[PDB]
Design a protein around this ligand. Structure first.
Ligand SMILES: *C(=O)[C@@H](NC(=O)[C@H](N)c1ccccc1)[C@@H]1N[C@@H](C(=O)O)C(C)(C)S1
Length: 261
């Protein structure tokens, strides 16, 4: 095991939880993995797959992103910071995708899922781009139960890192779609204390966070250092106590360790 893996193992030991990390350095397509093949609950990081699946649809339905979607009182769930502003009005699928990706809006996630025909349509898009690991089984917010050992709504760090690379830096999407996903991710507002907090602050970052029960605290990021090929970093973390507190600092610390090596 490398020096970076020993430092990640020590961070994990210090934290009392279970840490999964996958880095892809696209300059060499080298990988750094820590529990990279173990399953973790994705929580809201699954929003990237859902938004990208709608973007993939928009390659054929050219005006799909401007299609209005009604926001109704029954659509509201546990956390709806943007959609609650539009109850009994409408939001476009673009406005819903931005709400999901930039504010972690769970109503917006559910509208994306509905546009895809259910959670099976999100998983289908994962399989269509070569991700055999991702599975989405539930809508928001029950996809965040993060129960230890439950295979529902999980992926592995290695698989999520590979998928995030193909969506944002590869060509799993069309050029306008991929650029739109990059813009949305760069504009995320919920990640300041997660991967972003452990990285040199002249690196541009796009990321999507997630949180759930068992103190599950997740972040997935595409990172553009200046003068270097970009990297993809996935950091997943979960804890033994059902009511455990969020630990965004562990994700920052993992990113910092990765950025060193
Ligand atoms: C996705 O992770 C979403 N999580 C939830 O709705 C959870 N039920 C939850 C966990 C902890 C606190 C509140 C809700 C949304 N994304 C989260 C995130 O980006 O970390 C969230 C906490 C903003 S809600």
């Amino acid at each position: 095991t490398s020096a970076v893996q020993q430092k990640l193992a020590a961070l994990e030991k210090s934290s009392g939880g279970r840490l999964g990390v996958a880095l892809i350095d696209t300059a060499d397509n080298t990988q750094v993995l820590y529990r990279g093949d173990e399953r973790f609950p994705m929580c809201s990081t699954s929003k990237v797959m859902a938004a990208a699946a709608v973007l993939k649809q928009s390659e054929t339905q050219k005006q799909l992103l401007n299609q209005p979607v009604e926001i109704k009182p029954a659509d509201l769930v546990n956390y709806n910071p943007i959609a609650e502003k539009h109850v009994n009005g409408t939001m476009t699928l673009a406005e819903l995708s931005a709400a999901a990706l930039q504010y972690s809006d769970n109503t917006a996630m559910n509208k994306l899922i509905a546009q895809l025909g259910g959670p099976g349509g999100v998983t289908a898009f994962a399989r269509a781009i070569g991700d055999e690991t991702f599975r989405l089984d539930r809508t928001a917010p029950t996809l965040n139960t993060a129960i230890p050992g439950d295979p529902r709504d999980t992926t592995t760090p290695r698989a999520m890192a590979q998928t995030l690379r193909q969506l944002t830096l590869g060509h799993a999407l069309g050029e306008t779609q991929r650029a739109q996903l990059v813009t949305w991710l760069k504009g995320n507002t919920t990640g300041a204390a997660s991967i972003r907090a452990g990285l040199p602050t002249s690196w541009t970052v796009g990321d999507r966070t997630g949180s759930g029960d068992y103190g599950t605290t997740n972040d997935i990021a595409v990172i553009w250092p200046q003068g270097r090929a970009p990297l993809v970093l996935v950091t997943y973390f979960t804890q033994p106590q059902q009511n455990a507190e969020s630990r965004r600092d562990v994700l920052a610390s993992a990113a910092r360790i990765i950025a060193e090596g």
